[PDB]
Structure formats: structure tokens, C-alpha cells
Amino acid sequence: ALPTIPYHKLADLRYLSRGASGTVSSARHADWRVQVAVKHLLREAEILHKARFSYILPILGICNLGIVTEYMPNGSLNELLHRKTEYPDVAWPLRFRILHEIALGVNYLHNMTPPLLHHDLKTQNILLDNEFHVKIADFGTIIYMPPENYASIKHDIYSYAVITWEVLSRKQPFEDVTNPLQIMYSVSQGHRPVINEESLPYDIPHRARMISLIESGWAQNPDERPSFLKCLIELEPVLRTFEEITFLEAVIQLK
Amino acid sequence: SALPTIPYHKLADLRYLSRGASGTVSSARHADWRVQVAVKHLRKDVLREAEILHKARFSYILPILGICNEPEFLGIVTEYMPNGSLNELLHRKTEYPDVAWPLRFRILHEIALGVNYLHNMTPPLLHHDLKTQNILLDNEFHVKIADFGLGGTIIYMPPENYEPGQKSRASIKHDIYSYAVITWEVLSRKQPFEDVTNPLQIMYSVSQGHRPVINEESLPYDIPHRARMISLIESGWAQNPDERPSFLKCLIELEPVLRTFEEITFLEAVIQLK
Numbered sequence: 001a002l003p004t005i006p007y008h009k010l011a012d013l014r015y016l017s018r019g020a021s022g023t024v025s026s027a028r029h030a031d032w033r034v035q036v037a038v039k040h041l042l043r044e045a046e047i048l049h050k051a052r053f054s055y056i057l058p059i060l061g062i063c064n065l066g067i068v069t070e071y072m073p074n075g076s077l078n079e080l081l082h083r084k085t086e087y088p089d090v091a092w093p094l095r096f097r098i099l100h101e102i103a104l105g106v107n108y109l110h111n112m113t114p115p116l117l118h119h120d121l122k123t124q125n126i127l128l129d130n131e132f133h134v135k136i137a138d139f140g141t142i143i144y145m146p147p148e149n150y151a152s153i154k155h156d157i158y159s160y161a162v163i164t165w166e167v168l169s170r171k172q173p174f175e176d177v178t179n180p181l182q183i184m185y186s187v188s189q190g191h192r193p194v195i196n197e198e199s200l201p202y203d204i205p206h207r208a209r210m211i212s213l214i215e216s217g218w219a220q221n222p223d224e225r226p227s228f229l230k231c232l233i234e235l236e237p238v239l240r241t242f243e244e245i246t247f248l249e250a251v252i253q254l255k
Numbered sequence: 256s257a258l259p260t261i262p263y264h265k266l267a268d269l270r271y272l273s274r275g276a277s278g279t280v281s282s283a284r285h286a287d288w289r290v291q292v293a294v295k296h297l298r299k300d301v302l303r304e305a306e307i308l309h310k311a312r313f314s315y316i317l318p319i320l321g322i323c324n325e326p327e328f329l330g331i332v333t334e335y336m337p338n339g340s341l342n343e344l345l346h347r348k349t350e351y352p353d354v355a356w357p358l359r360f361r362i363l364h365e366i367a368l369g370v371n372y373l374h375n376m377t378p379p380l381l382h383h384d385l386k387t388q389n390i391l392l393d394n395e396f397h398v399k400i401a402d403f404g405l406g407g408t409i410i411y412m413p414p415e416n417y418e419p420g421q422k423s424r425a426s427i428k429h430d431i432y433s434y435a436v437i438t439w440e441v442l443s444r445k446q447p448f449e450d451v452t453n454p455l456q457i458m459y460s461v462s463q464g465h466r467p468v469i470n471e472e473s474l475p476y477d478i479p480h481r482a483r484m485i486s487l488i489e490s491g492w493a494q495n496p497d498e499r500p501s502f503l504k505c506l507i508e509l510e511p512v513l514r515t516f517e518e519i520t521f522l523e524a525v526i527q528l529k
């Protein structure tokens with residue numbers, strides 16, 4: 001049973017971001033005494049109360065039309081990666097925890113009955129909680145879209161491989177390509193964000209393995225791309241090489 | 256709004272945590288989800304209780320991840336809280352010599368935010384067994400309330416519940432009494448009614464009017480906002496249920512005390528435990 005929130009309970013309302021999916025605004029719940037987020041514009045809402053896991057954005061209720069969720073104080077992964085002035089240093093332990101937690105969230109979705117596929121994964125909708133843990137949300141840009149999409153369980157892995165490339169480089173994929181149709185043409189032809197020392201330096205922990213994960217993930221042939229299970233099996237040994245305190249020290253470095 | 260069914264064999268690396276009245280608690284890993292979980296080993300009565308608790312969608316309430324519906328055993332699968340309970344933080348002074356005031360106040364504010372949410376549900380969800388053993392701590396030491404009262408300690412029980420019935424079990428002012436004892440225990444790192452040898456003796460002292468010692472040895476003068484804290488404690492552990500405040504009035508009181516602490520001080524407090 002999904003609770004019903006009356007619009008008058010959502011005080012201090014302030015727009016966060018717009019979008020085709022709906023307009024998103026922050027607000028403070030008068031009775032709960034916490035910040036929430038509301039998305040203006042019912043059957044799919046219950047389908048998203050079934051999508052309940054540690055790395056999926058938690059839905060708190062329904063406005064009778066808006067969807068109330070938790071407020072992610074640290075915005076999106078896009079901001080963290082590309083606001084190099086606010087964040088000049090983003091340590092590897094945290095970048096690897098983000099990548100691990102994205103794969104966990106997507107894997108849970110794919111493991112539902114029926115398998116729920118996101119099909120719109122992008123750094124913009126990889127949200128960050130107060131401790132910089134990932135919450136997947138938002139079930140214009142094409143840099144994350146597989147070429148065959150210009151209905152497939154191999155869509156999200158393509159998006160994931162691009163996001164991984166971006167997390168590890170802090171570069172905008174197809175940086176020098178202004179026209180999105182020119183990106184779409186280079187991708188249809190099997191060209192991908194560049195892998196070299198300028199984009200992906202040698203100082204990256206487990207560099208070779210990450211490269212092979214990225215390259216297999218963004219493969220032209222959908223069937224040659226891994227499942228999130230194979231991809232999580234590859235990631236588990238990498239994450240084990242980081243001591244718990246290094247993630248905490250990585251976050252404190254951002255504050 | 257569906258609660259998934261988890262096949263017991265999908266749970267790898269099972270390891271015993273604690274045996275309690277409610278059942279046995281173990282830490283496992285879901286082979287499909289690739290995450291550690293906690294499984295509480297305890298049919299139609301249980302699936303209804305699980306859905307009642309499944310309604311609680313709040314940051315400071317322990318999330319239920321699924322039910323283990325085996326013909327042999329019946330289990331509840333929740334998120335695994337890696338830092339155990341508030342009790343271990345408070346009393347394992349060897350493992351945790353220093354527990355900074357910002358973390359202590361963050362814990363109390365989240366306990367109060369958790370309970371208030373439950374009391375605000377329709378119909379209200381009353382805990383009625385709040386104790387420091389069932390306030391669990393996540394990886395970043397944020398609170399998750401667990402072990403709802405559908406051989407344990409009496410030290411958080413209001414005197415009027417001692418001989419229970421219709422009024423005591425439907426009482427709103429039970430949870431706030433337990434909160435005042437937790438608050439007192441949090442600021443002191445002292446076992447309430449430590450000196451008293453018998454839990455039965457504790458029961459007499461309380462029913463008469465005695466409470467754990469609000470002095471200098473227990474509560475130092477260095478305690479931030481010592482005044483408003485001692486006020487709140489005393490008000491919440493009042494003999495007259497009517498004289499106890501709501502969790503909302505308790506939050507309103509707490510909020511400015513929390514604004515006093517800079518964000519980074521909570522992070523520093525955690526690095527200090529770890």
C-alpha cells in the first residue's frame with residue numbers, strides 16, 4: 001500500500017529541474033520534518049513501489065498528480081564528474097563504489113518479475129545521497145544510447161559502459177562533436193569515446209580490466225555485451241582492494 | 256507495492272548474528288542481488304505482519320527486502336546494517352573509546368524522526384519495545400529502527416505497562432518514555448539503573464518514581480545544550496503519561512540544537528570510530 005500525500009503538506013516548494021517525464025521540485029514535509037522531492041505528472045507508481053532496493057530512488061507516496069520521493073542532496077553523477085571547480089578531486093575508491101552501486105541497482109531491476117529495464121541510463125539521472133551513495137531514478141541526449149536503437153536486455157549495459165568511461169576520465173564523451181547527428185553517425189560505424197593515456201591515464205586502479213569491461217559493454221553486437229551478473233562478478237574483486245576508510249576519506253574530501 | 260519471495264538457497268555465506276525472543280538473526284548474501292542481507296528466522300499471520308511493516312517507507316526504519324516462504328522455515332529478509340546496534344556503540348568502550356557529540360545528536364534526531372514518522376502513519380504504527388539494542392546503525396552510522404513489538408530488559412518500559420492490558424498496549428505515550436531513557440543512555444554512555452542488582456528492584460524504584468541519575472558524574476557539564484536536553488529527558492520520562500510530549504514537539508526542540516553542528520563534524524565523528 002502506497003501512502004497518499006495531500007499537496008498542502010509539501011511546504012517550502014522550490015523547482016529543481018524540468019523535463020519531458022515531468023517537472024521535479026524539492027519541498028519539506030510538514031509532518032515528517034524532512035526534505036522530499038515531488039515530480040508533477042498512477043498505475044506505473046505501484047510498479048515503482050515494487051522497484052524497492054538500496055540503489056533505486058525511494059518513493060515515499062502519491063499526490064492525488066505527483067510522485068513524492070526522497071530528496072538526494074548531492075544531485076547527479078553528472079554534476080560530480082564535470083563541476084571540476086566545486087570538485088577538483090574525486091578519489092578512485094568513491095568512483096569505483098559509484099560504478100559498483102550503479103551495476104547493483106540496474107541488476108536488481110533486470111532481476112524483477114517481469115524484468116524492468118531502465119532504457120534511459122545517463123549520468124544525469126544517477127542521483128547521489130548525503131553519503132554519496134547512488135540512487136537510480138528517471139526510468140534529449142544520445143551519447144549513452146546503443147547504435148541499434150537509432151525491447152533489448154542489452155541496452156542498459158551500453159549506457160553503463162559509456163557512464164564507466166565518463167567516470168574514469170571525467171571527460172565529456174564525444175567532446176569535440178557539436179552535432180548529435182555526427183555522434184549518431186560515428187557510433188553506427190562502430191566508433192566510440194577514445195581509449196588512450198590522455199582520456200584514461202595509467203594511474204587508474206585496475207585500468208586494463210575496466211577497459212575490457214567498457215569495450216565489451218559498448219560492443220557493436222548486442223549479443224557480445226555482458227549481463228549485469230557477469231559485470232558484477234568482474235567488479236567484486238576490484239572493490240575488495242579498497243579499505244572501507246578510503247571511501248569515507250574520499251567523501252570527506254568532497255565536503 | 257509487492258513484497259518478493261526469496262528462495263532460501265538464493266542466500267549464500269550465512270553467518271549467525273544474534274538469537275532473540277523474535278527469532279535468530281543471520282547475515283547472508285543474495286546470490287542474484289550480490290548484496291549482503293540480514294535474515295530473521297522465525298504463515299498467513301506473518302505475511303500480513305510483513306505487509307504492515309512493508310508500508311513503512313522511511314529513511315530511518317529498517318527496509319524489508321523480501322520474505323523467505325519455505326515449508327521448513329519462515330524468514331524476513333532486510334537490509335544488512337553493518338555497524339550493529341546503538342547499544343554496542345554506547346557500551347563497547349574498548350572498540351569505541353571516543354563517540355563525538357555531533358554523531359550522538361545525529362543519532363537522537365534520527366531516532367526521533369523515525370518514531371514520529373511511524374506515529375504519523377494511518378493507522379499509527381507504535382513500536383512499544385524501543386531500546387538501544389534495536390536502533391541499528393548503517394555503514395555511515397545513520398539510524399534504522401527495527402524489532403517492533405508486534406526475556407528482555409525492562410529499563411525502557413514506562414511504569415504503567417508493567418501490568419499490561421487494553422489501555423497500556425493502545426498507549427501513545429509509551430515510545431516517548433523509552434526515548435528519554437535512550438537519550439539519557441546516549442549522553443551518558445552509562446547503563447540505566449546500573450547500581451540496582453535486580454531488574455525486579457528496578458521495577459519497584461521506577462513505579463515509586465525513581466529514574467537513572469541526572470547528575471555531573473553521569474551527565475558532564477561539557478554536554479552541548481545540557482539544559483534543553485535534561486529538560487526534554489525529564490519531560491519524556493514523566494510518571495503521568497499526559498505530561499509526556501509528542502515526537503513533533505520533541506523534534507521542534509531538537510532542530511536548533513542540530514543547526515549548531517557543522518556538516519563536516521558528523522563525517523569527522525565517523526572517521527574517528529572507523
Ligand SMILES: CS(=O)(=O)c1cccc(Nc2nccc(-c3sc(N4CCOCC4)nc3-c3cccc(NS(=O)(=O)c4c(F)cccc4F)c3)n2)c1
Binds near residue numbers: 016037057059139
Ligand atoms: C539540478 S538536479 O536536478 O541535478 C538536483 C540538484 C540537487 C538536488 C537534486 N535532488 C533530487 N532529489 C530527488 C530526486 C531528484 C530528481 S533530479 C531528476 N532529474 C531527472 C533528469 O535529469 C535531471 C535530474 N529527477 C529527479 C526525480 C524525482 C522524482 C522521481 C524521479 N524518477 S522516477 O519517476 O523514475 C521514480 C519514481 F517516480 C518513484 C521511485 C523511483 C523513481 F526512480 C526522478 N533530484 C537534484
Ligand SMILES: CS(=O)(=O)c1cccc(Nc2nccc(-c3sc(N4CCOCC4)nc3-c3cccc(NS(=O)(=O)c4c(F)cccc4F)c3)n2)c1
Binds near residue numbers: 335
Ligand atoms: C550482534 S547484532 O545482532 O547487534 C548485529 C551485529 C552486526 C550487524 C547486524 N546487522 C543487522 N542488520 C539488519 C538487521 C539486524 C537485526 S539485529 C536484531 N536484533 C534484535 C534486537 O536485539 C539486537 C539484535 N534484529 C535485527 C532484525 C532483523 C530483521 C528484522 C528485524 N525487525 S522486524 O522483524 O521488526 C522488521 C521487519 F520484519 C521488516 C521491516 C522492518 C522491521 F523492523 C530486526 N542486524 C546486527
